[PDB]
């Protein structure tokens with residue numbers, strides 16, 4: 001679960 | 017803790 | 033790992 005959350009934050013960061 | 021983090025990312029995603 | 037993710041979301045929130 002933690003690896004999917006990490007992936008979601010990375011993209012948000014990337015986008016933002 | 018993981019369920020609260022999931023909720024926080026979902027909203028960010030939603031907003032963004 | 034969860035504490036680093038928490039920190040990353042807090043900043044995103046802060047920024048956003």
Ligand code: NA
Nearest residue numbers: 003004007008
């Ligand atoms: Na994934």
Ligand code: NA
Nearest residue numbers: 019020023024
């Ligand atoms: Na909640």
Ligand code: NA
Nearest residue numbers: 035036039040
């Ligand atoms: Na840190």
Ligand SMILES: [Zn+2]
Nearest residue numbers: 007008011012
């Ligand atoms: Zn993706």
Ligand SMILES: [Zn+2]
Nearest residue numbers: 023024027028
């Ligand atoms: Zn809320």
Ligand SMILES: [Zn+2]
Nearest residue numbers: 039040043044
């Ligand atoms: Zn920082």
